[PDB]
Amino acid sequence: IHFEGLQRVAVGAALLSMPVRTGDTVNDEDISNTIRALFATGNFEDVRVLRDGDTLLVQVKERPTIASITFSMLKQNLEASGVRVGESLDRTTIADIEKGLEDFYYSVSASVKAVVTPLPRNRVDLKLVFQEGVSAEIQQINIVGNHAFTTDELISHFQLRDEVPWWNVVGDRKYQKQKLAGDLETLRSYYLDRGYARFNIDSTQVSLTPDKKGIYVTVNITEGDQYKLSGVEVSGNLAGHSAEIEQLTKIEPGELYNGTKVTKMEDDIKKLLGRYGYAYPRVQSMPEINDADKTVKLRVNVDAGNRFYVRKIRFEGNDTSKDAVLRREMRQMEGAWLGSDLVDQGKERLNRLGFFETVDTDTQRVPGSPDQVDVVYKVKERNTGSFNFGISFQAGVQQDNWLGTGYAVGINGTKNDYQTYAELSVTNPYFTVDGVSLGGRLFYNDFQADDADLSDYTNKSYGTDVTLGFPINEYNSLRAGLGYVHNSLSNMQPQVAMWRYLYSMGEHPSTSDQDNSFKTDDFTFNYGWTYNKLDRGYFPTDGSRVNLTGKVTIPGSDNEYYKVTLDTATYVPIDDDHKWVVLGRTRWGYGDGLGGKEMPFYENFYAGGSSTVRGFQSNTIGPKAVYFPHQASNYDPDYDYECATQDGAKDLCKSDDAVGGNAMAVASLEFITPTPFISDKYANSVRTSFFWDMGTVWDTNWDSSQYSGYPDYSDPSNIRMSAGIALQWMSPLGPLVFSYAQPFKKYDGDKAEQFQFNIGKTW
Amino acid sequence: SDSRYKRQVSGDEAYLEAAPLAELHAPAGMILPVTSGDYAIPVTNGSGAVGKALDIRPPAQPLALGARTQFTGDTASLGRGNTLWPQVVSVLQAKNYTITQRDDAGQTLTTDWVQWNRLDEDEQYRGRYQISVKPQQAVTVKLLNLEQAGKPVADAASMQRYSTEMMNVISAGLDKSAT
Amino acid sequence: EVPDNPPNEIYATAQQKLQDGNWRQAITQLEALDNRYPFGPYSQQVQLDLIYAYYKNADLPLAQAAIDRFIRLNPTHPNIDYVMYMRGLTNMALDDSALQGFFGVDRSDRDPQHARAAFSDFSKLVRGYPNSQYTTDATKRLVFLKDRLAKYEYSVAEYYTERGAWVAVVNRVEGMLRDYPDTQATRDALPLMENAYRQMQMNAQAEKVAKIIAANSSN
Amino acid sequence: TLERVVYRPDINQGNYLTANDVSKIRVGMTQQQVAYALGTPLMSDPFGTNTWFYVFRQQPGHEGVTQQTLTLTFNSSGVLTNIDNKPALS
């Protein structure tokens, strides 16, 4: 067994590429099979197999290794289609490499050629030459051939426009792939759409100008009258079975023939049978024309074809989150019978998580078995988290999907010469299974004024809580838990409303002079209800979500109260389920104390800022403190005060600061539009929205007893307003939210922003 | 700047702690499922380096500036000029290398212990070489020696690099003076 | 911006900046040196330096494509097995994303496509050239990869055990014994198939798997 | 304590056999026509023997598990020797 002579590939890879067995067999089908495999390796322009022995002889003409491709973005189509330096190019190339380069030069003309010049070593080098003209555009194209409707009315379609100015944009020429074939299909769908059954296009006419200055196309028809439909008859399978298929055919006699309704019936039946496990139900429609009658009887042929099961469910594309994350969000059972809307609910919930954008599903059959099917879920796995560092030292961090898991973890802290605050929240969903969530929260907030030491106002707050939610409906969950909050207050100076609360709590503080003491520990039972149906976990195109959080004190407890807050988000797309989408959101709150009341002043809702009403400074809308006089115990080491005796003011004093009320309302209406031009087409990572914000806060206890002067802090009355532009840009560091707006109102909303940058995580 | 990160892989070493593989004994009167596999590890006994000890730096087949060199070693390889092998000794003294064993008969000499230098190397290297010409004329440079911080190195990875380093110096001197 | 400096000297500057330097700044000169002189003499060594630098720079997609172009272009050889070890090594580096990567988390599930690709590349490397200095290391990475894939199948079998998926549990563990019978996660996955068989009210296969567990202990 | 809980979706596991479809099996099948109308069994037999396990298992809505198991034993020639049908469970 001797070869020859083989430049490039040696004996090692050549001998194993053919069924030789090396001594022996005589089969003369094995010379065609060995020669066919050697030709299948792609290393040879020509191969012979002869026997001069005894031993067998081979012949090899090695495939040329191209030294340089000289085109003379110019190498873009060549390096792809295609061949770079390297290979093995052969005779079939110059066939397809000529036509491919000819058709590839018409976008964004020429008649090319191929130059093969063999160099020493291994074979050849190529040089591709071009030609000046000519071009072709769309001179005159028409049918014959209609008589209804007018020819100009008949052609739109997706193309080709021959022709008229002005001023026209886009352009210009077109042919083949989606142009003339797709628009011929558009003419067929139009003619067959309104009446006109048995409509058949006769061939086509394609002609070139002798000067090659134009190209003419013509279509020959052959209309075929009207034939207004009468009745439908379904003949075939299956156990699916009938009543639904029969109810899908309910279109009544007397109506004209419509092809898009026939096809609509087809894919509706295919989706129906798809729900029950039949994934490939071959279905066709054969109308029966009646010439004497004005009618037609459609014959629907249906075969369900072996309801399909699910062999395996694989999740590709998750390099961070675990497999159980995506697998536990599924309703489809591996090793069971498949159905649609179960795999579509997997994509549904997967988007609902928001941990990945974008997710896609694919149903692919399995080789050898006309039963089993594998369903694959691909995920792009976007970034879940935000790192917030301000400086004073401020560090927050938020992670929805920790590493694997889907533990929702977040941390917050701030430290300076005055305030020290730390908060940690850990919520593990899918506690056990089914979606039961359990999480705790730890809370520490401590700040004094001047320290140095135990002189001025001090505030210290412990906090903790735990919550266990579960589902009820598919889209509905609700939570039950409890928490404990400790509060300790020294000094804090007098003010109207806060000391109305202090007066209601049984402690009489000395009216305005200086200091006092308060210590209160409260235990609360917190409940919640969360309804979520959304397009995806973030940047939702269509959906809505409603959250309801509440807490009621339990005995024995110092503070006695109850609080309820509710939020609503709604996304309505205005075209089809994408692009332009109008959103709105509302945040309502309220509460009160039980018995002799009153709700504590570390409860009260605030508003304004990026979270509620944009264009306003944070935590000030409706209520604002009204002080009394008082003494200091510190006074003036360069500090200036609001109201004190010497520097003398005593009657009672208004304030720029803000306390906050026990009732609040906020509503935002956003017009969400696609990001402006210079767009990525990956721009799904950034959202641009106009918006109109509104809200207010009020304390249900006010006066009356104060006959002033100082405003009415119990009233919806004057609310706050804003309007402007805001955008959200997803970075690697976190989602960025900036806004420029405000006001239509305020109306003494006090401070303002008009520019807000938040990371965030901010709604 | 320990310079050892350029000679090592990226990820961790945890894959060395992986427990070995032991097949399953089948019970009497039955078999296991069979087989595919489709995952297989044929028996190969050592002996080479593992983990961070393996040198992942790209191997060496320079220089070749006729120019094409033959295979590696244990050996070096370098259409040709006319005559005058002593050009090799003139470029050998142009680098002021120390020369001990000297023979002008077979156009071969033994180059001494003068140390090398490299940026990506951790401690340092050095070694003694042998240069010869065997006629239409081909210069070959082998070596028997190695030291890294005084320790001998017989490994096949560094032999190519530090044979081709001396071959690079010879090719630099002869390339300079010859042009 | 790389200059027009003579083609032999640009590889010298990129050679020093490759040894000591930060990579990619030298990678630029290596890519320009790949453009110039399309076929040799430096094209081979320039391509290998592009591979090594791409990998050590976490350029791994471009590295991958590079060694693929090399191993398809000129598989003479040596030196290839280094390039194959770089294929399996890069595919293994595509796993372990990671900051996870810091803590003690178990990557065993995630998406094991890159581990399978690395197992194929190292497999064709050893089966292959069981000589070159990187073989045994590739072998140990092969047993690690096999055990890891078995760990993925064991993870899916664990969750589906928690869900009541026992048919899918038996199919998964059966797929483990039909792929990686000698790994750890298969022996640890036998009691899952036993519990699935018993939970499905099939006691014959349950006793069979029970005797299989009685044959060995671990591991 | 769990006497009564919520919530949970339906979990369907097995081959879907309709009753009367099961009535279409008979002794003397070629194992090719068994797969014709029943399905390709999602559970078959390791270890070492030939049996096709057709299991019908359902677990809707916290109600309860309903599973009927039909196991078929085939000879070495591809003909079923044995049929074992056990509806429900105990």
D21 to chain A: closest CA residue? A239
Token code pair at residue A672: 């969400």
The answer to whether chain D touches chain C by having 3 or more C-beta pairs less than 8 angstroms apart is: yes
Token code pair at residue A215: 């190209």
Q: Where are any strands of DSSP class E within A429-471?
A: 437-447, 458-471
Rounded to a whole number of angstroms, the distance between the first and last alpha carbons of chain D is: 25
| One-letter identity of residue A391 | I
| A323-336: b (≥16 Cβ within 10 Å) or e | bbbbbbbbbbbbbb
State the CB neighbour count (10 A cutoff) for residue A166: 4
Closest Cβ–Cβ partner in A335, A434, A471 for D42: A335
- Chain C residues within an 8 Å CB radius of A84: 69
Q: Per this entry, what is the length of chain C?
A: 219
Element (H, E) at C83: helix C81-94
| A203-214: b (≥16 Cβ within 10 Å) or e | eeeeeeeeeeeb
φ/ψ region of A225 (left if φ > 0, alpha if ψ in -120 to 50, else beta) reads: left
> Sign (positive/negative) of CA torsion A339, A342, A347, A348?
positive
CATH architecture of A140-220: Roll (3.10)
Tell me how many domains chain D contains.
1
Element (H, E) at D72: strand D66-74
Q: Per DSSP, what are the bridge partners of residue A524?
A: A483, A553
Can the peptide bond before residue C128 be classed as cis, meaning omega within 30 degrees of 0?
yes
User: C80: which residues sit within 8 A by CB, 6+ positions away?
Assistant: C71, C129
Interface contact A474, partner D, CB < 8 A: yes
For chain A, domain boundaries: 65-129, 140-220, 232-302, 309-379, 386-758
Give the β-pairing of A735-741 and A756-758.
antiparallel
Q: What was the structure determination method?
A: X-ray
Q: The domain A309-379: what is its CATH number?
A: 3.10.20.310
Closest Cβ–Cβ partner in D43, D71, D89 for C170: D43
Q: Per this entry, what is the length of chain B?
A: 179
Q: Per DSSP, what are the bridge partners of residue A141?
A: A217
Size of interface A-D (CB pairs under 8 A): 42
Let me know if the fold of A232-302 is the same as that of A386-758.
no
Q: H-type helices in A485-644, by residue range?
A: 496-504
Best to test chain C binding among A41, A122, A322 (most C CBs inside 10 Å): A322
Q: The domain A386-758: what is its CATH number?
A: 2.40.160.50
Three-state secondary structure call for residue B147: strand
In angstroms, rounded to a whole number, what is the distance separating the alpha carbons of residues A586 and A695?
9
Q: Where are any strands of DSSP class E within A392-452?
A: 393-399, 408-415, 419-428, 437-447
Three-state secondary structure call for residue C210: helix
CATH of the domain at D79: 3.30.1450.10
A321 to chain C: closest CA residue? C110
CATH of the domain at B141: 3.30.530.50
Tell me which residues of chain B have a C-beta less than 8 Å from any C-beta of chain D. 26, 29-33
- Chain A residues within an 8 Å CB radius of C69: 84, 86
| One-letter identity of residue C169 | V
Token code pair at residue A708: 């002033």
Contact across the interface for C38 and A316, Cβ inside 8 Å: no
Residues 29-48 of D with CB under 8 A from B: 46-48
Measured in degrees and rounded to the nearest 5, phi and psi for residue A530 equal -125, 115
In angstroms, rounded to a whole number, what is the distance separating the alpha carbons of residues B47 and B156?
12
CA A167 from centroid of its chain's CA atoms: 38
Token code pair at residue A155: 């052609």
Q: Count CA atoms within 13 Å of residue C89 on its CB side.
A: 30
- As to burial, measured by CB atoms within 10 angstroms (0-12 exposed, 13-18 middle, 19+ buried), residue A486 is middle
- As to burial, measured by CB atoms within 10 angstroms (0-12 exposed, 13-18 middle, 19+ buried), residue C132 is buried
- Chain A residues within an 8 Å CB radius of C162: 433
> Sign (positive/negative) of CA torsion C10, C14, C15, C17?
positive
Residues C149 and C143: beta-carbon distance below 8 Å? no
Interface contact D7, partner B, CB < 8 A: no
* Smallest Cα distance from C47 to chain A, Å: 14
Rounded to a whole number of angstroms, the distance between the first and last alpha carbons of chain B is: 39
The residue with tokens 């024995």 is A556
Can the peptide bond before residue A639 be classed as cis, meaning omega within 30 degrees of 0?
no
- Give the closest residue to A721 by CA, choosing from A752, A689, A759, A699: A752
Residues B132 and B107: beta-carbon distance below 8 Å? yes
In angstroms, rounded to a whole number, what is the distance separating the alpha carbons of residues A481 and B48?
60
Measured in degrees and rounded to the nearest 5, phi and psi for residue A477 equal -130, 165
Closest Cβ–Cβ partner in D7, D13, D40 for A371: D40
Q: Per DSSP, what are the bridge partners of residue D72?
A: D52, D83
Token code pair at residue C167: 């048919």
- Chain C residues within an 8 Å CB radius of B46: 136
Q: Count CA atoms within 13 Å of residue A730 on its CB side.
A: 13
- Chain C residues within an 8 Å CB radius of A320: 97-98, 100, 110
Three-state secondary structure call for residue D43: strand
Q: H-type helices in B71-155, by residue range?
A: 87-94
User: B107: which residues sit within 8 A by CB, 6+ positions away?
Assistant: B85, B88, B132, B133, B134
User: A676: which residues sit within 8 A by CB, 6+ positions away?
Assistant: A688
Tell me how many domains chain C contains.
1
Q: Count CA atoms within 13 Å of residue A274 on its CB side.
A: 16
User: A567: which residues sit within 8 A by CB, 6+ positions away?
Assistant: A546, A547, A585, A586, A587, A588, A763
Q: Which chains touch D (3 or more CB pairs under 8 A)?
A: A, B, C
State the CB neighbour count (10 A cutoff) for residue C157: 26
State the CB neighbour count (10 A cutoff) for residue A508: 10
Contact across the interface for C19 and B6, Cβ inside 8 Å: yes
**Residues in chain A preceding a C-to-N separation beyond 2.5 angstroms (breaks):** 72, 108, 391
- Give the closest residue to A543 by CA, choosing from A592, A513, A578, A504: A578
Rounded to a whole number of angstroms, the distance between the first and last alpha carbons of chain C is: 58
Residues A348 and C174: beta-carbon distance below 8 Å? no
In angstroms, rounded to a whole number, what is the distance separating the alpha carbons of residues A12 and A15?
6
Contact across the interface for D16 and A311, Cβ inside 8 Å: no
Contact across the interface for A86 and C69, Cβ inside 8 Å: yes
- Chain A residues within an 8 Å CB radius of C39: 67-68, 85
Closest Cβ–Cβ partner in B20, B38, B120 for C179: B38
Token code pair at residue A225: 């009258």
* Smallest Cα distance from C156 to chain B, Å: 19
Residues A629 and A645: beta-carbon distance below 8 Å? yes
Contact across the interface for B50 and C140, Cβ inside 8 Å: yes
Residues C13 and C28: beta-carbon distance below 8 Å? no
Choices 3.10.20.310, 2.40.30.20, 3.40.190.10, 1.10.1840.10: CATH for A232-302: 3.10.20.310
Best to test chain A binding among C73, C107, C111 (most A CBs inside 10 Å): C111
Contact across the interface for C215 and B10, Cβ inside 8 Å: no
Residues C117 and C129: beta-carbon distance below 8 Å? no
Contact across the interface for C96 and B12, Cβ inside 8 Å: yes
Three-state secondary structure call for residue C8: helix
User: A493: which residues sit within 8 A by CB, 6+ positions away?
Assistant: A457, A514, A627, A630
| One-letter identity of residue A658 | A
Token code pair at residue A394: 């401020």
In angstroms, rounded to a whole number, what is the distance separating the alpha carbons of residues C101 and B12?
9
Helices C60-73, C43-56: crossing angle, 10 deg rounding: 150
Q: Per DSSP, what are the bridge partners of residue A390?
A: A394
In angstroms, rounded to a whole number, what is the distance separating the alpha carbons of residues A262 and A285?
7
Range of the domain at D37: 14-90
Residues A283 and C80: beta-carbon distance below 8 Å? no
In angstroms, rounded to a whole number, what is the distance separating the alpha carbons of residues A529 and A332?
26
- Chain C residues within an 8 Å CB radius of D14: 167
D57 to chain A: closest CA residue? A336
CA A108 from centroid of its chain's CA atoms: 32
DSSP codes of every residue in A325-381:
HHHHT----TTEE--TTTHHHHHHHHHHH-SSS-EEEEEEEETTEEEEEEEEEEE--
Residues A415 and A390: beta-carbon distance below 8 Å? no
User: D57: which residues sit within 8 A by CB, 6+ positions away?
Assistant: C166, C167, C200, D12, D13, D14, D65, D66, D67
Measured in degrees and rounded to the nearest 5, phi and psi for residue A606 equal -115, 180
* Smallest Cα distance from C180 to chain D, Å: 16
Token code pair at residue A88: 């093995």
Residues A763 and A586: beta-carbon distance below 8 Å? no
Contact across the interface for A337 and D9, Cβ inside 8 Å: no
| One-letter identity of residue A328 | R
- Give the closest residue to C182 by CA, choosing from C204, C136, C149: C149
Range of the domain at B131: 56-179
Count, in order, helices (H) and strands (E) of chain D: 0, 5
Q: Count CA atoms within 13 Å of residue A464 on its CB side.
A: 5
Residues 183-212 of C with CB under 8 A from B: 183-184, 186-187, 208, 211-212
Token code pair at residue A87: 């290979």
User: C150: which residues sit within 8 A by CB, 6+ positions away?
Assistant: C176, C179, C180, C183, C184, C185, C186, C189
In angstroms, rounded to a whole number, what is the distance separating the alpha carbons of residues B148 and B7?
15
Residues A421 and A413: beta-carbon distance below 8 Å? yes
Token code pair at residue A757: 């940058």
In angstroms, rounded to a whole number, what is the distance separating the alpha carbons of residues B173 and B175?
5
In angstroms, rounded to a whole number, what is the distance separating the alpha carbons of residues C72 and A516?
84
Q: Per DSSP, what are the bridge partners of residue A559?
A: none
Interface contact C163, partner D, CB < 8 A: yes
Three-state secondary structure call for residue A632: coil
Size of interface A-C (CB pairs under 8 A): 72
- Give the closest residue to B27 by CA, choosing from A574, D48, A323: D48
Token code pair at residue C115: 């581990």
Interface contact A334, partner C, CB < 8 A: yes
The residue with tokens 């037609």 is A296
Q: What is the DSSP letter of A252?
A: P
Contact across the interface for C82 and B30, Cβ inside 8 Å: no
| One-letter identity of residue D55 | V
User: D87: which residues sit within 8 A by CB, 6+ positions away?
Assistant: D68
Size of interface B-C (CB pairs under 8 A): 138
State the CB neighbour count (10 A cutoff) for residue A680: 9
In angstroms, rounded to a whole number, what is the distance separating the alpha carbons of residues D72 and D85?
9
- As to burial, measured by CB atoms within 10 angstroms (0-12 exposed, 13-18 middle, 19+ buried), residue A3 is middle
Q: Per DSSP, what are the bridge partners of residue B133?
A: B139
Q: Where are any strands of DSSP class E within A535-662?
A: 543-553, 561-573, 581-593
Could you give the C-alpha distances from A481 to A400, A429, A440, C37, D23, in angstroms and in order?
21, 14, 9, 72, 54
Measured in degrees and rounded to the nearest 5, phi and psi for residue B160 equal -65, -45
C97 to chain A: closest CA residue? A319
Contact across the interface for D55 and C164, Cβ inside 8 Å: no
Q: Which fold has domain A65-129?
A: Ubiquitin-like (UB roll) (3.10.20)
3-state helix/strand/coil string of chain C: CCCCCCHHHHHHHHHHHHHCCCCHHHHHHHHHHHHCCCCCCCHHHHHHHHHHHHHHCCCHHHHHHHHHHHHHHCCCCCCCHHHHHHHHHHHHHHCCCCCCCCCCCCCCCCCCHHHHHHHHHHHHHHCCCCCCCCCHHHHHHHHHHHHHHHHHHHHHHHHHHHHCCHHHHHHHHHHHHCCCCCCHHHHHHHHHHHHHHHHCCCHHHHHHHHHHHHHCCCC
State the CB neighbour count (10 A cutoff) for residue A146: 17
Overall resolution, Å: 3.4
- As to burial, measured by CB atoms within 10 angstroms (0-12 exposed, 13-18 middle, 19+ buried), residue B46 is exposed
| One-letter identity of residue A457 | Y
Token code pair at residue B88: 């090799």
In angstroms, rounded to a whole number, what is the distance separating the alpha carbons of residues C59 and A674?
33
- Chain B residues within an 8 Å CB radius of C19: 6, 118-120
Residues A217 and A141: beta-carbon distance below 8 Å? yes
State the CB neighbour count (10 A cutoff) for residue C149: 20
In angstroms, rounded to a whole number, what is the distance separating the alpha carbons of residues A84 and C35?
12
- As to burial, measured by CB atoms within 10 angstroms (0-12 exposed, 13-18 middle, 19+ buried), residue A5 is exposed
User: A7: which residues sit within 8 A by CB, 6+ positions away?
Assistant: A62, A122
State the CB neighbour count (10 A cutoff) for residue A649: 14
CA C148 from centroid of its chain's CA atoms: 10
Sheet holding A232-236, edge to edge: A232-236, A296-302, A283-289
CATH of the domain at C110: 1.25.40.10
- As to burial, measured by CB atoms within 10 angstroms (0-12 exposed, 13-18 middle, 19+ buried), residue C144 is buried
| One-letter identity of residue A57 | L
Give the β-pairing of A296-302 and A232-236.
parallel
- As to burial, measured by CB atoms within 10 angstroms (0-12 exposed, 13-18 middle, 19+ buried), residue A126 is buried
CA A152 from centroid of its chain's CA atoms: 42
Contact across the interface for D14 and A434, Cβ inside 8 Å: no
- Give the closest residue to A200 by CA, choosing from A216, A213, A219: A219
- Give the closest residue to C176 by CA, choosing from A433, A312, B44: A312
* Smallest Cα distance from D45 to chain B, Å: 9
Interface contact C26, partner B, CB < 8 A: no
User: A559: which residues sit within 8 A by CB, 6+ positions away?
Assistant: A505, A520, A522, A553, A593, A600
Range of the domain at C9: 1-219
The answer to whether chain C touches chain A by having 3 or more C-beta pairs less than 8 angstroms apart is: yes
The residue with tokens 């109201």 is A643
In angstroms, rounded to a whole number, what is the distance separating the alpha carbons of residues C205 and C193?
9
State the CB neighbour count (10 A cutoff) for residue B150: 8
